[PDB]
């Protein structure tokens, strides 16, 4: 029996009309959605554009050159034995490239969400008025009004506007670009000499090459999330809690996606099955989505005018079939259909893909077959929301339901099950390879240091666009934490000058800490924090869920920040939900404050609380 | 039904808009001006990303010093201070790098097939009902190929830099075109004249776009009728031998002083009438034969014409293959386009489309054709795709209706005669000094010219970065010299060069950084085979190990100018003699090296693995 949600849905009027077929040479025919995966010309053009964006921001020549510098920095961290990140090994270098790019995009998205919270909290009175006065308008229209009363940097919710507002660092990672020119299948036969091991360390196995050719990261902008967050929000606190709840789920999926590459298994590929010789009025489509950043998959079937879907777990497969247990059913889907198979990479999460599938199922009678095909493929392949305003709102309402506490899917249960299954796979693959080949060969190809995106020791390069009296400001957001333990932070600063005086500022709820290091080309430890099982830390006597680090350098060239956990495979923290975020509230308004290194005296350095300063002039104490 | 090819639109020839069948219909990229504009912009972006005009201008001074340091004889020196030679070097260097990378990927594919020849032979023999594309997937999976997709989308994702087709208009941007001297034989005036190209070379570049075929394209025609692994490998080498010879001819057309023709489409001036007709004229710059395709109604006709031996009155030469009556005097709008497929690939689809002329709609015929010529996008109709690959093999095989060796030879003789005629004409008009500036006699063919190939290294062994260069195969016979230039941040460094043969390798240690250093001198006979330490070889692998490297360049130079050509090998020539390339994969670790390890050592001396230390 298909799952039936009692969600209220707006009526949908199709462009095709009562006869459910568009007329030739009409304005509606020109604005109709059309298939992108099925059409070869579009599926080729979009891959080329996706590759171009990756090479613009991340150049292989630059990343190959920075390997020597990055290896030295990781060595200088002085990690314990068994926790060292050796970038001289090819597999470790390849995994670091994937990890560093994925973390930078996740960090930037988290940074923008933090600023968006600050603008909402500053304008709480106006925001509260909008939410309660305007409850009948569409979710997209509510987002436009909310982004206007607050002085948001990105005030556009349209797809074209979001693309323009997005900058380098949030571009999805194109997997095939990373794994280009890397040697595969180096063969040393029964040799344990140092020369043979050196050659062995320079190559990767075929499995890692296959994993990278099927990888494409998904990072959701805050402007995308504000529409689901404001569908039923009544107060500003509820809206902020919804925004934080969604990004908690999103971040947890990103860590799982990186964990898939670390294990020795190959990741499945999303594909579409179409008839070999399509016949008019007898066509069918089958869509199989294996999201890399997720714990659940989707199978959608379009036979006639009927839409049927199934949600299957990506863990526990016996290798006899590519589908796990079914968690939510929406009809009967036949995955044994015979036809041409087309491979694609999804640009939306499982929660986003399912929301449109539920909305499309309710609109099957009111929408033509072509509209269902066009709207689904555009969103899966290009993250393009449907132009039908009523259908778009229905998708956002379902998106809120799948994330709320009353979701039909228990996301926490499935995410935890996926972590346990992935850990077992790594042990099985390592043990199997430890028998067939040596322990040394097993360590090269399956490193134990790389576990998940927010556990492995990773670096994040900082970009600087703000200059205060000659000092460039580099910003890094410490936290939030999905793991508990002891975490160390280090900063690497490269400057053209021979001798340089650079400063670091750590901002909390009440006061900030200012440090001076004056050491170049070597990591310098700035902060050591202890995170409890609830993900909060005690920074100068108060509980903090996140902090802000600002680095000031004169004539800077590159500033890197290293994040390090004391023990490998740090225990995880249960993912926060809406109730958890509402219960405890932290003020982030102080992250906007800045200091001027040039006008700094010796007494101003150290830990100082806000009451010691005047309004403004946070550099100099009274 | 009777027809194996089934049109997306039924016999009614009507498909409702907004339906799945209409969504997957092919698009006329050439005829649509929105589609043509978009393709050109993406192509220019890809070229500008990998090759930067601001970078090539900066590297001009460094390259000029290296070319002079080769100490070439008088009459064979390459002078990059002259603008004409620099522009020709820019086009040639990128052309040769793309061909070099394609050849390297072919050698890896050959090694992979030979490692699993038992499984490959089973696939080829047992399974014959599946299409060419399906057969390629199974072969590319049985062998552990790095690239396992034959789909156009997967190919573009895994194509990588260095194989991107050269964009002529980007190269020709910003170069001075008109300089007058007005009877001034002076050092200052001659220096000024050497800074500008002439109008003829500008027009040549604006109609230039190279075509480089990936081995994943070649595999589908190769395996379409192959029954054994040897036949599959022999077919792969035969196709690439034809491609390399055509690529050489493409560069020679820029060296000789005449304007190359531009491919165009003629369509009726009035759009949306009853009468529908289209004429396509394809002038492949990388070839010796052209194609003229005419579609009036549902009738398709083609004519293959020679691109050589043509008077100024008519652009078309003699017709070497006929497929109907084509009228090239039709009047209408002319839209110029750049073909992205070879003449054989274009001809293969034309034969397949003619067979299914009445089984497909006109929009399907046009969309499938234009997508292939302008995007190298294979038709989605699987039945149509299979027939095209069968014709591609036939056009390459020994039973080809076209004698490719005869036409390629005539093109070479015709181009040489044109260079002599143009040089003599300008010598009388202006003088010897001006004529040499504009028509350099040192360039000639692509694989005859002294050229450099910048190397990219992604493999580091114990802090030493490996740069791989494949020596050969050679289409000319004579004496060849190879040199290596190493730019390293360290003030003093030691770098190693290794040359892998069938039985043993040669280890060389060098110290000189910025000046080129000669690594290997070879003699190649009329069969394109060299004797490297008592064993006949068709190609060798050169690996350079440099610590903290910034750039590594390899210079190829022939002792004599205009080296005589070697007859292009065919399928029968490739299966006759077999060479083993499985040894091109093994590496050495320069860090763990001793004085006794350097030199020429056979495999017997080494252990299993440990190709560094000579103790068995």
């Amino acid at each position: 029996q298909a799952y039936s949600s009692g969600l209220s849905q707006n009526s949908i009027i199709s462009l095709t009309g009562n006869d459910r077929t568009v007329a030739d040479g009409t304005f509606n025919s020109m604005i109709m959605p059309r298939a992108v995966i099925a059409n070869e010309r579009e599926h080729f053009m979009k891959t080329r554009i996706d590759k171009i964006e990756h090479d613009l921001n991340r150049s292989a020549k630059q990343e190959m050159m920075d390997r020597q510098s990055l290896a030295e920095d990781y060595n200088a961290l002085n990690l314990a034995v068994g926790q060292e990140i050796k970038l001289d090994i090819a597999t470790q270098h390849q995994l670091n490239r994937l990890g560093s790019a994925m973390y930078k995009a996740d960090h930037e998205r988290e940074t923008e969400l933090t600023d968006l919270i600050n603008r909402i909290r500053e304008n709480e009175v106006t925001v509260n008025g909008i939410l309660e006065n305007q409850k009948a308008i569409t979710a997209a229209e509510r987002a436009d009004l909310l982004l206007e009363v607050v002085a948001s940097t990105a005030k556009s919710v349209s797809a074209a506007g979001r693309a323009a507002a997005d900058g380098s660092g949030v571009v999805p990672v194109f997997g095939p670009s990373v794994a280009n020119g890397i040697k595969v299948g180096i063969d040393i036969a029964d040799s344990v000499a140092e020369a043979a091991i050196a050659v062995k360390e320079s190559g990767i196995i075929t499995q890692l090459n296959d994993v990278y050719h099927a990888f494409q990261s998904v990072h959701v902008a805050p402007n995308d999330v504000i529409k689901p967050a404001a569908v039923v929000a009544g107060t500003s606190t509820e809206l902020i809690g919804n925004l934080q709840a969604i990004y908690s789920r999103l971040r947890s999926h990103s860590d799982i996606g990186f964990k898939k590459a670390t294990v020795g298994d190959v990741i499945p590929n999303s594909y579409m099955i179409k008839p070999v010789n399509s016949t008019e009025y007898a066509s069918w489509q089958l869509y199989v989505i294996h999201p890399v950043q997720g714990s659940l998959g989707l199978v959608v079937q379009l036979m006639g005018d009927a839409l049927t879907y199934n949600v299957f777990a990506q863990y526990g497969n016996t290798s006899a079939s590519e589908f796990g247990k079914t968690v939510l059913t929406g009809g009967a889907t036949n995955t044994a259909l015979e036809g041409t198979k087309v491979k694609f990479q999804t640009k939306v999460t499982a929660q986003q893909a399912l929301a449109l599938t539920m909305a499309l199922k309710d609109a099957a009678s009111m929408l033509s077959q072509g509209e269902l095909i066009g709207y689904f493929e555009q969103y899966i392949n290009l993250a393009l929301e449907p132009d039908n305003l009523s259908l778009q709102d229905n998708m956002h309402k379902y998106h809120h339901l799948l994330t709320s506490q009353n979701s039909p899917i228990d996301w926490n249960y499935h995410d935890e099950e996926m972590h346990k299954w992935l850990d077992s796979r790594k042990t099985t693959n390592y043990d199997a390879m430890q028998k067939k080949d040596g322990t040394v060969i097993a360590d090269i190809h399956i490193p134990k240091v790389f576990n998940d995106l927010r556990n492995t020791t990773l670096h994040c390069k900082l970009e600087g666009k703000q200059t205060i009296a000659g000092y460039t400001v580099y910003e890094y957001l410490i936290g939030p934490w999905a793991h508990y333990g002891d975490i160390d932070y280090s900063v690497v600063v490269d400057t053209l000058n021979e001798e340089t005086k650079w400063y670091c500022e750590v901002i909390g709820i009440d006061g900030h800490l200012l440090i001076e290091k004056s050491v170049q080309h070597k990591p310098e430890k700035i902060l050591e924090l202890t995170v409890n099982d609830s993900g909060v830390t005690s920074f100068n006597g108060r509980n903090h869920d996140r902090l802000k680090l600002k680095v000031y350098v004169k004539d800077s060239l590159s500033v890197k920040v290293f994040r390090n956990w004391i023990g490998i495979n740090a225990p995880r923290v249960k993912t926060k939900m809406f109730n958890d975020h509402i219960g405890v509230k932290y003020d982030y308004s102080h992250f906007d404050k800045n200091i001027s290194p040039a006008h700094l005296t010796l007494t101003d350095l150290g830990w100082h609380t806000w009451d010691q300063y005047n309004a403004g002039n946070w550099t100099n104490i009274k | 039904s009777q027809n194996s090819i089934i049109s997306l639109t039924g016999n009614d020839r009507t498909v409702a808009d907004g339906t799945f069948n209409s969504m997957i219909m092919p698009r006329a990229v050439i005829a649509n001006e929105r589609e043509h504009f978009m393709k050109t912009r993406i192509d220019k972006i890809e070229h500008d990303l990998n090759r930067s005009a601001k970078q090539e201008m900066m590297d001009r001074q460094s390259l000029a010093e290296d070319y002079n340091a080769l100490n070439l004889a008088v009459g064979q020196e390459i002078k990059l201070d002259i603008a004409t030679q620099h522009q020709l070097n820019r086009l040639g260097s990128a052309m040769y790098k793309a061909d070099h990378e394609r050849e390297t990927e072919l050698t890896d594919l050959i090694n992979r097939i030979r490692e699993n020849e038992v499984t490959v032979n089973g696939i080829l023999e047992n399974q014959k009902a599946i299409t060419a594309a399906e057969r390629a997937d199974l072969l590319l999976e049985v062998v552990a190929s790095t690239a396992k997709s034959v789909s156009a989308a997967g190919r573009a994702a895994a194509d990588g830099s260095g194989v991107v087709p050269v964009f002529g208009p980007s190269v020709a941007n910003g170069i001075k075109v008109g300089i007058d001297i007005a009877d001034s034989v002076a050092e200052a005036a001659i220096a000024v004249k050497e800074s500008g190209i002439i109008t003829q070379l500008n027009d040549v570049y604006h109609a230039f776009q190279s075509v480089h075929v990936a081995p994943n394209d070649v595999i589908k025609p190769a395996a379409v009728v192959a029954g054994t692994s040897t036949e599959l490998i022999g077919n792969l080498q035969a196709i690439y031998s034809r491609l390399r010879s055509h690529s050489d001819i493409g560069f020679k057309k820029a060296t000789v002083g005449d304007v190359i023709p531009n491919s165009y489409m003629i369509k009726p001036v009035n759009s949306t009438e009853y009468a529908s007709w289209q004429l396509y004229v394809i002038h492949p710059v990388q070839g010796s034969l052209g194609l003229v395709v005419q579609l009036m109604g549902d009738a398709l006709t083609y004519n293959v014409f020679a691109q050589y031996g043509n008077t100024s009155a008519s652009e078309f030469g003699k017709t070497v293959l006929t497929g109907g009556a084509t009228n090239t005097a039709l009047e209408g709008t002319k839209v110029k386009f750049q073909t992205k497929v070879t003449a054989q690939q274009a001809l293969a689809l034309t034969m397949a489309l003619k067979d299914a002329a009445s089984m497909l709609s006109q929009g399907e015929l046009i969309g499938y054709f234009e997508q292939y010529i302008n995007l190298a996008l294979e038709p989605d109709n699987l039945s149509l795709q299979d027939n095209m690959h069968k014709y591609h093999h036939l056009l390459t095989s020994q039973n080809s209706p076209i004698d490719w060796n005869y036409h390629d030879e005539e093109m070479h003789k015709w181009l040489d005669s044109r260079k002599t005629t143009n040089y003599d004409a300008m010598q009388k008009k202006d003088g010897t000094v001006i004529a040499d500036i504009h028509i350099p006699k040192v360039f000639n063919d692509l694989r005859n010219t002294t050229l450099h190939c910048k190397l990219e290294g992604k493999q580091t062994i114990a802090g030493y970065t490996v740069y791989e260069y494949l020596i050969g195969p050679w289409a000319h016979y004579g004496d060849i010299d190879y040199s290596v230039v190493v730019d390293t941040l360290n003030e003093e460094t030691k770098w190693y060069c290794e040359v892998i043969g069938i039985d043993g390798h040669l280890l060389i240690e060098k110290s000189v950084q910025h000046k080129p250093e000669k690594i290997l001198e070879l003699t190649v006979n009329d069969s394109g085979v060299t004797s490297f330490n008592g064993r006949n070889h068709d190609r060798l692998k050169l690996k350079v190990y440099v610590k903290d490297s910034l750039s590594v360049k390899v210079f190829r130079n022939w002792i004599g100018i205009n080296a005589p050509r070697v007859k292009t090998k065919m399928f029968n020539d490739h299966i006759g003699v077999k060479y083993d390339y499985s040894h091109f994969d093994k590496n050495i670790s320069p860090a763990h090296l001793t004085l006794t390890d350097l030199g020429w050592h056979t495999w017997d001396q080494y252990n299993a693995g440990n190709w560094t230390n000579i103790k068995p």
Binding site: Q62, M65, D66, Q68, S69, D494, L496, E498, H521, L557, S558 | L489, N490, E491, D548, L550
Partner: peptide, 14 residues
């Protein structure tokens, strides 16, 4: 400028 090139150029000058 890469961090590798900057460190190498700094060493040469010093």
């Amino acid at each position: 400028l890469s961090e590798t090139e900057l460190r190498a150029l700094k060493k040469l000058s010093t």
